[PDB]
Write a protein that binds this ligand. Structure first.
Ligand SMILES: CC(C)CCC[C@@H](C)CCC[C@@H](C)CCC[C@@H](C)CCOC[C@@H](CO)OCC[C@H](C)CCC[C@H](C)CCC[C@H](C)CCCC(C)C
Ligand SMILES: CC(C)CCC[C@@H](C)CCC[C@@H](C)CCC[C@@H](C)CCOC[C@@H](CO)OCC[C@H](C)CCC[C@H](C)CCC[C@H](C)CCCC(C)C
Ligand SMILES: CC(C)CCC[C@@H](C)CCC[C@@H](C)CCC[C@@H](C)CCOC[C@@H](CO)OCC[C@H](C)CCC[C@H](C)CCC[C@H](C)CCCC(C)C
Ligand SMILES: CC(C)CCC[C@@H](C)CCC[C@@H](C)CCC[C@@H](C)CCOC[C@@H](CO)OCC[C@H](C)CCC[C@H](C)CCC[C@H](C)CCCC(C)C
Ligand SMILES: CC(C)CCC[C@@H](C)CCC[C@@H](C)CCC[C@@H](C)CCOC[C@@H](CO)OCC[C@H](C)CCC[C@H](C)CCC[C@H](C)CCCC(C)C
Ligand SMILES: CC(C)CCC[C@@H](C)CCC[C@@H](C)CCC[C@@H](C)CCOC[C@@H](CO)OCC[C@H](C)CCC[C@H](C)CCC[C@H](C)CCCC(C)C
Ligand SMILES: CC(C)CCC[C@@H](C)CCC[C@@H](C)CCC[C@@H](C)CCOC[C@@H](CO)OCC[C@H](C)CCC[C@H](C)CCC[C@H](C)CCCC(C)C
Ligand SMILES: CC(C)CCC[C@@H](C)CCC[C@@H](C)CCC[C@@H](C)CCOC[C@@H](CO)OCC[C@H](C)CCC[C@H](C)CCC[C@H](C)CCCC(C)C
Ligand SMILES: CC(C)CCC[C@@H](C)CCC[C@@H](C)CCC[C@@H](C)CCOC[C@@H](CO)OCC[C@H](C)CCC[C@H](C)CCC[C@H](C)CCCC(C)C
Ligand SMILES: CC(C)CCC[C@@H](C)CCC[C@H](C)CCC[C@H](C)CCO[C@H](CO)COCC[C@H](C)CCC[C@@H](C)CCC[C@@H](C)CCCC(C)C
Ligand SMILES: CC(C)CCC[C@@H](C)CCC[C@H](C)CCC[C@H](C)CCO[C@H](CO)COCC[C@H](C)CCC[C@@H](C)CCC[C@@H](C)CCCC(C)C
Ligand SMILES: CC(C)CCC[C@@H](C)CCC[C@H](C)CCC[C@H](C)CCO[C@H](CO)COCC[C@H](C)CCC[C@@H](C)CCC[C@@H](C)CCCC(C)C
Ligand SMILES: *C\C=C(C)/C=C/C=C(C)/C=C/C1=C(C)CCCC1(C)C
Ligand SMILES: *C\C=C(C)/C=C/C=C(C)/C=C/C1=C(C)CCCC1(C)C
Ligand SMILES: *C\C=C(C)/C=C/C=C(C)/C=C/C1=C(C)CCCC1(C)C
Lengths: 230, 230, 230
């Protein structure tokens, strides 16, 4: 409790933990192989996020980075989380639309570049260079958002109506929430330092819970996750 | 030789090295694509374990973690090994029974959470919190063991008799040997410190060789790894 | 500019950056799913290499390792690059010949062992032991080259002529360029220290650009990357 951001970390932990348990319970019983894929991916996302929120809460996922003449507290565990959870979120979207394997590789690959360069920016000791990594990461993000809107063209023809409507809602959720992440980082403790760490942590907790648990609720309540069957 | 556990590390290295070479030689010649998968996975497991045993032997895979007021020697390389070898062992089991892809994702994902939280517990400097990570890791392990017993139901109907009988033996080996790992960690150098590092290393070497080389011998001697063919 | 090797790092960065943009532009428009796979993989390789060249250029990807009584500047970011880019290059080759999944696992697995042991050797503080890791890594490399020449036998029968001819050229490029890497490391700053870091960096930049951008140009200009279609 010695760090004012503790409360949001605690709340993040709880909410990811409850979402994990809810999805685990919800997917008990499902037999449809397509649904099984979506439950697995979607349950793992908040399970991973639970562990990394806990790690931040306990202090393990925090480090001090010198830059601007100071020791800046940097929560590195967020990158360990997103390294796995963001390709998993993309896979859910990808599977929904039956994406080509080349498209899934491009998405997962650009996403790893996004998170890996954000991690490098987060740990960089030359203040100005932190923003170069931020720009490159942001370019990888723009690429991903591009592909999510303009890369699933040949799939329109043969998309069930429910699949298309759940994909569009999840795609919109994804595009609005993920785009806030470079902005928060840029104004927050990792960037310009205009928004204090405690508010930054609040923002990230609200975005993370929405993009993971919120996203998963929408998905796992849709019939789009089942094969079409009599 | 300055650390009494050196001998078990040396023996571990040798045994993983010999098992690797045996499996490499044994799979030379195989053409059946299904068998090829099982040889690959099964040869990589002890090859990876060889490198990480060597790293412990040479001192590279050892670190000192402060906790309980002391510098505790923690072999971190075990987590680098298991991070890859335990999903590979699970994949062998998964492929045997033709598991659904959602099931394989759940297994590999829970296994990464098991090893990643064990690594966090192993490196945590607040003694009491080490056991929180141990509990979470152990919960992920229980999940995996659950899935291995109750998640391959729809597959019974259409399982060749030899596949079912090799899977059950390998599943039993897996469940008994993997369950010892949280116990050894808990009583050993990473946990309560009741069993000294040198005996802890002996235990881990005996379990690892059995679960990897022992497991692989059973598997690679079965006809369950070949497609059914005239 | 304080390190004489800066210029090759800068040039490496530029060339990987331009190759990335060229391949991105070149693959815009492609619809053939098989081609899409090859573009994705092949565009990601220099994109990843761009980020890690930049990281070396900026100083983030450099560390000092004590050995031989000295602080040796070791560029660790090369291993972060190759950890992903070399399995991706192998996948391009693998997909060309429609390799069995067991073969792809063996290749990707041996490649991870190659890079992971090279990383361990690069960071090892006992000078003599660095070369043990070099030998093990080199053995994994020889295995890969073996598989690339003698592991795609059953595939000859049913290989389009263009696929076979592009695969052979790319396989030859791969075998000559990758084999230089253990030699450069062995004589360079990570090994015997016979070739200074600045020339070592030049060598690695010339090899990397050739094996990634050079390789990708050959591939992406071939018709072997398209499904056979009327
Ligand atoms: C059996 C397994 C699945 C794992 C069990 C471990 C466990 C759920 C995590 C412990 C959390 C935590 C209180 C750590 C101790 C902190 C001190 C104060 C303080 C609030 C933080 C909480 C973690 C919030 C609740 C989480 C849910 C019950 C889910
Ligand atoms: C956390 C616990 C509930 C686990 C311990 C329980 C043990 C065994 C008993 C539970 C068991 C009956 C599970 C029942 C569900 C059934 C199958 C579950 O999962 C379905 C699928 C695909 O359909 O993937 C879904 C993929 C999922 C992946 C599993 C990851 C989990 C592992 C533990 C850590 C997490 C964090 C949650 C903590 C909170 C508190
Ligand atoms: C390594 C992953 C690469 C693979 C890409 C191939 O694409 C296939 C799909 C589904 O068809 O899943 C592939 C995507 C899946 C995503 C789940 C986890 C991912 C992690 C990617 C980066 C990590 C790096 C390792 C540390
Ligand atoms: C050509 C490649 C496949 C790799 C070659 C490298 C090699 C096999 C590893 C060297 C091991 C080791 C003796 C390191 C030096 C330690 C000193 C004492 C001491 C006992 C440890 C051993 C490693 C045990 C034998 C291993 C097998 C021969 C397999
Ligand atoms: C260690 C050495 C024997 C390698 C160096 C040799 C070189 C080339 C000559 C050997 C060569 C003729 C291999 C013959 C086998 C053939 C195909 C081999 O593998 C079969 C499959 C799928 O069926 O995957 C199987 C997957 C396997 C993965 C390969 C990993 C290995 C790489 C080296 C490090 C290891 C550690 C073992 C050290 C001991 C001593
Ligand atoms: C990344 C891996 C995720 C993938 C999951 C999809 O499942 C597919 C199967 C077989 O059909 O193989 C997938 C499982 C394979 C296992 C081999 C290695 C694994 C490693 C997983 C975690 C690592 C994290 C990176 C560091
Ligand atoms: C919008 C995104 C795709 C990412 C934008 C960021 C950007 C391309 C990288 C900046 C590089 C660099 C000059 C960093 C600053 C160094 C100082 C001197 C000095 C030479 C190094 C260069 C990076 C070479 C040119 C690269 C290409 C234009 C491609
Ligand atoms: C670097 C930028 C051009 C990205 C920012 C742009 C944004 C959106 C606008 C560009 C957009 C119209 C892309 C057009 C191409 C179309 C589809 C692209 O890709 C095709 C495939 C499979 O066929 O995979 C190909 C796989 C590829 C993977 C994407 C990785 C990239 C991400 C950014 C960092 C890199 C480094 C290059 C820097 C130079 C300077
Ligand atoms: C983890 C990857 C394991 C997988 C292996 C299965 O093989 C399937 C193929 C194509 O059919 O792609 C698999 C190969 C793909 C390669 C792209 C990235 C790879 C990375 C492998 C090691 C990394 C370790 C994590 C840090
Ligand atoms: C958020 C992100 C940026 C992360 C993206 C990926 C990322 C984790 C990249 C990592 C590369 C790298 C470790 C960088 C090192 C930085 C540093 C200064 C040093 C590290 O940190 C330390 C310092 O003490 C130890 O590293 C050396 C040991 C290794 C970390 C582990 C070695 C593993 C291998 C030798 C065994 C072989 C593994 C494979 C066979 C796996 C293949 C899968 C298959 C079987 C299917
Ligand atoms: C046993 C376990 C817990 C491990 C489970 C996974 C684990 C390795 C998670 C790692 C996340 C993370 C690095 C945590 C950092 C902790 C620390 C304090 C800092 C690190 O350690 C150091 C400190 O000096 C360096 O890190 C920063 C650089 C990176 C490690 C590497 C960057 C890679 C990228 C920028 C390039 C893009 C890669 C992708 C394109 C890959 C996608 C595959 C595709 C092409 C198919
Ligand atoms: C070039 C190479 C050698 C690299 C090859 C692979 C390599 C990166 C191996 C890494 C293992 C390991 C971290 C070694 C540690 C060395 C060191 C001394 C300590 C580390 O470095 C630091 C020190 O401060 C932090 O580590 C601990 C935290 C972890 C790094 C991250 C934890 C992740 C998890 C707890 C969450 C679960 C993840 C999975 C669910 C992913 C599964 C995918 C799925 C969902 C499909
Ligand atoms: C799991 C929850 C979400 C939505 C995760 C998203 C992570 C990103 C979209 C990260 C983006 C970054 C960019 C684009 C620029 C650098 C800093 C980040 C790594 C935060
Ligand atoms: C390769 C050999 C085997 C059987 C590896 C197994 C590793 C585990 C089952 C690890 C389990 C752990 C748990 C469940 C609790 C924390 C400590 C561990 C990481 C050792
Ligand atoms: C991306 C460009 C290329 C060709 C990368 C290749 C990397 C290798 C072939 C690395 C080999 C190593 C060996 C075999 C021995 C130890 C040192 C290395 C890691 C450099």
């Amino acid at each position: 409790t010695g760090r004012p951001e503790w409360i949001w970390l605690a709340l993040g932990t709880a909410l990811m933990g409850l979402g994990t348990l809810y999805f685990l319970v919800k997917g008990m019983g499902v037999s449809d192989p397509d649904a099984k894929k979506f439950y697995a991916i979607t349950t793992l996302v908040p399970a991973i996020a639970f562990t990394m929120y806990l790690s931040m809460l306990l202090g393990y996922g925090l480090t001090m980075v010198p830059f601007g003449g100071e020791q800046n507290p940097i929560y590195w565990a967020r990158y360990a989380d997103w390294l796995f959870t963001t390709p998993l979120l993309l896979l859910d979207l990808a599977l929904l639309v039956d994406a080509d394997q080349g498209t899934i590789l491009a998405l997962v690959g650009a996403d790893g570049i996004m998170i890996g360069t954000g991690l490098v920016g987060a740990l960089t000791k030359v203040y100005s260079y932190r923003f170069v990594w931020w720009a490159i990461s942001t370019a990888a993000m723009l690429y991903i958002l591009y592909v999510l809107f303009f890369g699933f063209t040949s799939k329109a023809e043969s998309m069930r109506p429910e699949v298309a409507s759940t994909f569009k809602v999840l795609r919109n959720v994804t595009v609005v929430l993920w785009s806030a992440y470079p902005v928060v980082w840029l104004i927050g403790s990792e960037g310009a330092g205009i928004v204090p760490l405690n508010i930054e942590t609040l923002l990230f907790m609200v975005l993370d819970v929405s993009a993971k648990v919120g996203f998963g609720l929408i998905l796992l309540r849709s019939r789009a996750i089942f094969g079409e069957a009599e």
